[PDB]
Amino acid sequence: SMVKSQKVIDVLNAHYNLNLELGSVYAQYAHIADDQFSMPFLAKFINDLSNDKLGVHKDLISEYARKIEIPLHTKFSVDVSFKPTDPKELVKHILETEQKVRKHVANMAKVCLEEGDFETFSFVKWFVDDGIKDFDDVRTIHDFFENGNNNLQVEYAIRKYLKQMKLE
Amino acid sequence: SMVKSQKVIDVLNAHYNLNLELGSVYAQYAHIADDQFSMPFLAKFINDLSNDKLGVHKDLISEYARKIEIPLHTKFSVDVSFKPTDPKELVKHILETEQKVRKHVANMAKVCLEEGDFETFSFVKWFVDDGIKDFDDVRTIHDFFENGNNNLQVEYAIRKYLKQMKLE
Amino acid sequence: SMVKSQKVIDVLNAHYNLNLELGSVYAQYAHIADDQFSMPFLAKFINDLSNDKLGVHKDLISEYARKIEIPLHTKFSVDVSFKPTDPKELVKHILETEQKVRKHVANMAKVCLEEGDFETFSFVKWFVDDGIKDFDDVRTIHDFFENGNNNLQVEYAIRKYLKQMKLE
Amino acid sequence: SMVKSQKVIDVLNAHYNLNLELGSVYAQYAHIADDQFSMPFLAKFINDLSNDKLGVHKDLISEYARKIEIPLHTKFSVDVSFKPTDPKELVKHILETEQKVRKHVANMAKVCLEEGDFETFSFVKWFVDDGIKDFDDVRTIHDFFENGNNNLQVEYAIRKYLKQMKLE
Amino acid sequence: SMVKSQKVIDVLNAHYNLNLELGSVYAQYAHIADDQFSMPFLAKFINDLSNDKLGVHKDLISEYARKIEIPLHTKFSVDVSFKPTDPKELVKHILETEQKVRKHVANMAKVCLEEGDFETFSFVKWFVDDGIKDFDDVRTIHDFFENGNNNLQVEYAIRKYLKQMKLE
Amino acid sequence: SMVKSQKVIDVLNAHYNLNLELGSVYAQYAHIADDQFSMPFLAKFINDLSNDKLGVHKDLISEYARKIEIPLHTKFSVDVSFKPTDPKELVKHILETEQKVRKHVANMAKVCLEEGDFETFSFVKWFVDDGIKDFDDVRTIHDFFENGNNNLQVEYAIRKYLKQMKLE
Ligand SMILES: [Cl-]
Ligand SMILES: [Cl-]
Ligand SMILES: [Cl-]
Ligand SMILES: [Cl-]
Ligand SMILES: [Cl-]
Ligand SMILES: [Cl-]
Ligand SMILES: [Cl-]
Ligand SMILES: [Cl-]
Ligand SMILES: [Cl-]
Ligand SMILES: [Cl-]
Ligand SMILES: [Cl-]
Ligand SMILES: [Cl-]
Ligand SMILES: [Cl-]
Ligand SMILES: [Cl-]
Ligand SMILES: [Cl-]
Ligand SMILES: [Cl-]
Ligand SMILES: [Cl-]
Ligand SMILES: [Cl-]
Ligand SMILES: [Fe+3]
Ligand SMILES: [Fe+3]
Ligand SMILES: [Fe+3]
Ligand SMILES: [Fe+3]
Ligand SMILES: [Fe+3]
Ligand SMILES: [Fe+3]
Ligand SMILES: [Fe+3]
Ligand SMILES: [Fe+3]
Ligand SMILES: [Fe+3]
Ligand SMILES: [Fe+3]
Ligand SMILES: [Fe+3]
Ligand SMILES: [Fe+3]
Ligand SMILES: [Fe+3]
Ligand SMILES: [Fe+3]
Ligand SMILES: [Fe+3]
Ligand SMILES: [Fe+3]
Ligand SMILES: [Fe+3]
Ligand SMILES: [Fe+3]
Ligand SMILES: [Fe+3]
Ligand SMILES: [Fe+3]
């Protein structure tokens, strides 16, 4: 009677796999930030985003899938081809990816409401709120570049932003 | 003059991608352990293995690749199709996968010595030692099944093993 | 029966003297950094490199030479003639010198393996690992210059890097 | 595929048994030091060497043998016939025995490399490094005799050396 | 006038060598427990028995031999051929060996009284009391097998017994 | 107007290079003390003297040279050929070298006064006072040999002297 609809099963499966995929993609972006641009604090910020998708984000979804007793299957592929010309272009690309994440998460909420799945509608709220927060954090990093003159100044701003994020 | 050989670049790239791939695969195995077999402590053990491949293992390799200034590229695919009939079969499959990891790591050391790359030969020692340790941990879990009569007894043994591992 | 080969004796003697020589050379480079460029935090970084070659590096080698009972003799000369035009050129010159150190250390490992001297092969691992770490630290300082616009910004980045190194 | 070669199995078995054998032999040497020469601090030093061979050394090998799943069998015999005329001759005999241990350990490393057994090659490094350290400790005790005039002076030097060893 | 009889000298020499011999034998039994039966807590219990024979037991005897100024000589051989079919058979074999130890120790006390050697009669009391205690500990482990249904249950009981022994 | 005379520039340059030279020479003497004479506490004393010349002594001079804005250049050579027959001869040779250091430092003070360079005259006072203190410490070690009968007794006296020096 609490048997979940296939539409809900599909959006949860898609979003589980998206976090594994994007977590792996973002790990390569963090590598690029340090390897190509010599910006290790930008790399730390991107690696924190990667770690959240590869860890908490996917862990929460599979945990919840088990509670509501739906099938979950892992299938995705990664082939990171993006070649940014400069670090701001890398951050803008990540920003545009987080905008897609916000869209995916909104569609999850929409489908849950359509199906009257209030359990999953409530579960998805965490991703709605985290979607806008991650997007806003990335856009702050992006706007450092447009407020500065060189990568060392941006690195300084990122290092302090990271400390501030850890102080909740 | 410290320009690394393509053979070394290739084995490091392969092993970086293998850890991302296997980390994602093992996360689905941990899900199966809890979802299908209702063995959450077995799932915790497998999830710890997953977290190490998705975290420390790949992080160490990309970090080292940047120091020696080699190209690193992310490309892999995951499609978890394994359907174990019982939890011991799942653990045995993981054991056989860790045996392949030991082989891959041995081949890395072999190729480094062939190329006279003592920097990378020394780096790889961490994976040699961790390869045998992970394999041995998995085989201990496997031998719990052959020493017990039901999954609850095994769960008890795993929970205590995990505490013991955390006490280094 | 554990009488060491002349080839091993020679590479250890050469590397002992190289650290005394380079330690003295780097002390003059640190002086130049402060005296000519008014970059005292760059000078601190270079002086730390000097202190390690003049201290730990040479101390470890002579200590080990005594254990394996080989002759050790001190003979080297220093005449620091390098006149950098700017501080990045100074750091690049140090980077190229650390690249030579990596080559010398690799040759030590190669000769130990050729002679079946596993005692010294294991001893040399410390210098292999320290070679790549020192090189990477210097290259980080170098890349500060290419990420910044003036020496004060670089000084800021070096001061923070030094704090980070002291926090292991 | 990680099935270990008989040559590696043999050197590990030999070295396990050698540590049990030498540990028992050295316990009798420690007895001689106190019983015949009335040098209880020399006896403490020798008993510490005995305890390490009978304890940590053999424990590490059997532990590792189980991980790599090789056969291990115990067979050795002890018949301590050495009759030193004075305590320096006893210490020199131990020194010559530790020189044989260094040779045995080097042969283990050599055989591991020949077989491409990097797991065991890495395991053996602990014994390479401990071989030279034990040898050097014994030779320090030996050189006390050639720096002193009577056994009480040597006993004083040994007691302080032991304190120093315990302060790592 | 306190010159000890040859009969007492012989039983002390025999018991010194027996502890070295049995300590080495029991170390192989502990290996079997873990290697063949995958019972690491049974192995810990047996290794503790081994450590006591190789350590305290033999150390006490040689210490005492020196005080009473008797000759002590080390000669024994070990060739562990026992192949238990299951872990209870291994523990029963150890139990029967500790029964022989109790007999040997009783004979030591008997011979001391015959010779009027009250010094050694009092010394031997420690081994009389430890003989029955070790025997009783082993028999408790043995009776775990006959109270349980599988090795995991026994392992649980042994782990708790070991904690209890450490709480004196 | 505070432009320093060439005579002062020369004595400071000479004394900077002398400390690098002697620091390197004394490091080889410390090696000889341990390697040839098996006197590790004598080696510690000599190594402390070496460390002071290679560290504080040269660091103070280059620091001061930068403040008064004089040229400083590094050029020296080391070829340690001294072959002492016994450890007292080694210590006497060091004593005679510290006597030369006292002469060099006195000449520095003399030249500063001649030139009316009170800044450098005051700076040099630290080396005047340290010159006599180092000389006196070395002569105390030397007089241990003439108060003792063997190297172990001297080693004892040096170890206690070193503790006393560390208690200021
Ligand atoms: Cl850039
Ligand atoms: Cl852009
Ligand atoms: Cl820039
Ligand atoms: Cl099941
Ligand atoms: Cl199976
Ligand atoms: Cl079950
Ligand atoms: Cl400049
Ligand atoms: Cl440049
Ligand atoms: Cl500038
Ligand atoms: Cl004597
Ligand atoms: Cl001798
Ligand atoms: Cl004497
Ligand atoms: Cl069984
Ligand atoms: Cl039985
Ligand atoms: Cl069972
Ligand atoms: Cl001498
Ligand atoms: Cl003299
Ligand atoms: Cl002497
Ligand atoms: Fe659940
Ligand atoms: Fe997030
Ligand atoms: Fe977040
Ligand atoms: Fe890097
Ligand atoms: Fe290591
Ligand atoms: Fe791992
Ligand atoms: Fe691990
Ligand atoms: Fe030494
Ligand atoms: Fe270093
Ligand atoms: Fe370093
Ligand atoms: Fe094991
Ligand atoms: Fe040892
Ligand atoms: Fe040791
Ligand atoms: Fe005694
Ligand atoms: Fe009593
Ligand atoms: Fe006992
Ligand atoms: Fe006991
Ligand atoms: Fe200055
Ligand atoms: Fe001084
Ligand atoms: Fe001083």
All residues at 6 or more sequence positions from A117 whose CB lies less than 8 Å from its CB, including other chains:
A4, A5, A8
The counts of H helices and E strands in chain D are 6, 1
Tokens 């873990």 belong to which residue? E34
d(CA A21, CA B159): 31
Q: Mind giving me the DSSP string for D17-78?
A: HHHHHHHHHHHHHHHHHHHTT--HHHHHHHHHHHHHIIIIIHHHHHHHHHHHT-----EEEE
DSSP string, E131-165: HHHHHHHHHHHHHHHHH-SSHHHHHHHHHHHHHHH
Strand, coil or helix: what is C84? coil
Q: Tokens 């352990």 appear where? A: B33
Answer for the pair B43, B30: CB distance below 8 angstroms, yes or no.
yes
Q: What are phi and psi of D156, to 5 degrees?
A: -60, -45
Spacing of C-alpha A105 from chain mean position: 11
- The residue type of E153 is Q
Residues near D143 by Cβ (< 8 Å), separated by ≥ 6? F38
Cα angle, residue D79 at apex, residues D76 and D85 outer, rounded to 5°? 140
Q: Produce one character per residue of B23-35: b if its CB has 16 or more CB atoms within 10 Å, e if not.
A: bbbbbbbbbbbbb
Among the listed residues F86, F75, F81, the one whose alpha carbon sits nearest the alpha carbon of residue F28:
F81
| Chain E partners within 8 Å of B144 (Cβ) | 152
Q: Would you state the structure tokens that stand for residue E45, as one six-digit string?
A: 């219990």
B-chain residues within 8 Å CB-CB of C136? 67
Contact E50, E23 (CB under 8 A): yes
How remote is the CA of residue E94 from the centroid of ligand 21, in Å? 59
Q: Is chain B touching chain A, with at least 3 CB–CB pairs below 8 Å?
A: yes
Which amino acid type is present at position A132? I
Q: What are the distances in angstroms from CA C152 to CA C40, C136, C163, E62?
A: 10, 22, 17, 72
End-to-end CA distance of chain F: give it in Å, rounded.
Answer: 41
B116 closest CB neighbour out of C102, C106, C136:
C106
Residue with tokens 């005296």: C35
Q: Kind and range of the H or E element at A77?
A: strand A75-79
CA–CA dist D31, E67 (Å, integer): 11
Cβ count within 10 A of residue D83:
9
Q: Which residues surround ligand 21, an ion (CB under 5 A)?
A: A 134
H/E stretch holding C100 reads helix C87-114
Q: Where are the beta strands (DSSP E) in chain E?
A: 75-79
Sign of CA dihedral C122, C123, C126, C127: negative
**Alpha helix positions (H), chain F:** 6-35, 40-52, 58-68, 87-114, 118-147, 151-166
Other beta carbons less than 10 A from residue B163's beta carbon: 9
Q: Does residue C68 belong to the interface with chain D, where contact is any CB pair within 8 Å?
A: yes
Touch E-B: 3+ C-beta pairs under 8 A: yes
H or E segment to which residue E117 belongs: none
Nearest CB to B148: which of E37, E40, E152? E152
Distance between start and end Cα atoms, chain E:
41
CA distance D145 to D57: 28
The partner residues of F109 in beta bridges, in order of sequence, read none
Residue contact C153–A149, C-beta within 8 A: no
For residues B138 and B162, the answer to whether their CB atoms sit within 8 Å is no
Structure tokens at C123: 């001893």
Instruction: Please identify which residue in the block is written with the tokens 């979003």.
Output: A15
* Residues sharing a CB contact under 8 Å with residue A11, sequence separation 6 or more, in sequence order: A104, A107, A108, A111, A112
Neighbouring residues of D128: CB distance < 8 A, sequence distance ≥ 6: C118, C119, C122, D105, D106, D109
Closest CA to E154 of E54, E45, E72, E59: E45
The span from the first CA to the last CA of chain A, in angstroms, equals 41
Q: Are chains C and F touching, using the cut-off of 8 Å on CB pairs and a minimum of 3 such pairs? A: yes
Identify from E152, E154, E155, E156 which residue to disrupt to test chain B contact, counting B C-beta atoms within 10 A and taking the largest count: E152
- Tell me how far apart the alpha carbons of residues C154 and C148 are, in angstroms, rounded to a whole number: 6
Distance CA C95, CA C97 (A): 5
Please report residues of D whose CB lies closer than 8 A to that of F151: 147-148
What are residue B76's DSSP bridge partners? A78
Nearest to A38 among C143, C149, C160 (CB): C143
Q: Give the pairing of strands A75-79 and D75-79.
A: unpaired
In angstroms, the separation between the Cα of residue C111 and the nearest Cα of chain D is 15
CB A145 within 8 A of CB A154: yes
Place of tokens 């899900």: B31
Q: Report whether B58 contacts A27 (CB < 8 A).
A: yes
CB contact under 8 A, B118 and C128: yes
Helix axes F151-166, F40-52, angle to 10 degrees: 40
Measure Cα distances from B164 to B147, B159, D64 in Å: 19, 9, 18
For residues A158 and A141, is the Cβ–Cβ distance under 8 A? yes
**Residue length of chain F:** 168
Residue B97's nearest CA partner among B34, B160, B28 is B28
Burial class (CB in 10 A: 0-12, 13-18, 19+), F52: middle
The amino acid that residue A165 corresponds to is M
Range list of β-strands (E), B28-160? 75-79
CB contact set of E44 (below 8 Å; sequence gap of 6+): E30, E158, E162
Chain B contact for A62 (CB, 8 A cutoff): yes
Q: Give the C-alpha separation, C74 to C59, whole Å.
A: 13
> C132: buried, middle or exposed (CB in 10 Å: 19+, 13-18, 0-12)?
buried
Q: What is the DSSP letter of A54?
A: I
Phi first, then psi, for residue E83 (nearest 5°) are -125, 85
From F41, C70, F38, F29, select the one nearest D137 (Cα to Cα).
F38
Q: Which of F25, F28, F76 sits opposite C78 (nearest CB)?
A: F76
Burial letters C88-124, b for 16+ CB under 10 A, else e: bebbbebbebbbebbeebbbbbebbbebebbbbbbbb
**Residue A24 carries which side chain, given as an amino acid letter?**
S
Q: Give the integer Cα–Cα distance in Å for C29 and C94.
A: 9
What is the total residue count of chain C?
A: 168
Report how this structure was experimentally obtained: X-ray
Contact D122 B128 (CB under 8 A): yes
A132: left (phi over 0), alpha (psi -120 to 50) or beta: alpha
Q: Which residues of D touch F159 (CB under 8 A)?
A: 160
Q: How far is Cα A18 from Cα B20, in angstroms, rounded to an integer?
A: 14
Give the Cα-Cα-Cα angle C73, C77, C83 (nearest 5 degrees): 150
Assess contact for D131 and D95: CB atoms under 8 A: no
DSSP tally for chain E: helices H, then strands E? 6, 1
Contact (CB, 8 A) for A162 and A44: yes
Pick the closest to residue E76 from F130, A164, D80 (CA basis): D80
Nearest 5°: phi and psi at B126? Answer: -60, -40
Q: How far apart are CA F75 and CA C76, in angstroms?
A: 11
Q: Nearest-5° angle of CA C117, CA C123, CA C124? A: 90
CA torsion sign, B96 to B101 to B102 to B106?
A: positive
CB atoms within 10 A of CB D84: 17
CB contact under 8 A, C79 and F78: no
Three-state DSSP at C77 gives: strand
- Residues of chain B with C-beta less than 8 angstroms from the C-beta of A83: none
- Please tell me the distance from the alpha carbon of residue F19 to that of residue D95, in angstroms, as a whole number: 40
Identify the nearest ligand to the CA of E96 by its number: 14
Tell me how far apart the alpha carbons of residues B74 and C4 are, in angstroms, rounded to a whole number.
46
Query: Are A42 and A154 a contacting pair, CB within 8 Å?
Result: yes
Given a contact cutoff of 8 angstroms between Cβ atoms, the answer to whether F4 and F68 are in contact is yes
User: Out of E55, E58, E73, whose CB is closest to D80?
Assistant: E73
Closest residue to F24, CB basis, from C28, C55, C74: C74
Q: Which residue has the tokens 């704090």?
A: C163
Q: Is A83 left (phi over 0), alpha (psi -120 to 50) or beta?
A: beta
Q: Is B129 on the interface with C (CB under 8 A)?
A: no
Residues contacting residue E96 through CB under 8 Å, at least 6 positions apart: none
Subunits close to D (at least 3 CB pairs below 8 A): B, C, E, F
Q: Does A107 touch chain B (CB under 8 A)?
A: no
Resolution, given in Å to one decimal, reads 2.0
Instruction: Please give the structure tokens belonging to residue C129.
Output: 């690992």
Question: Is A54's CB within 8 Å of B58's CB?
Answer: no
**Encoding tokens for residue F127?**
């080396």
Chain B residues with CB inside 8 Å of A37's CB?
none
In whole angstroms, give the CA distance from residue F3 to residue D6.
Answer: 79
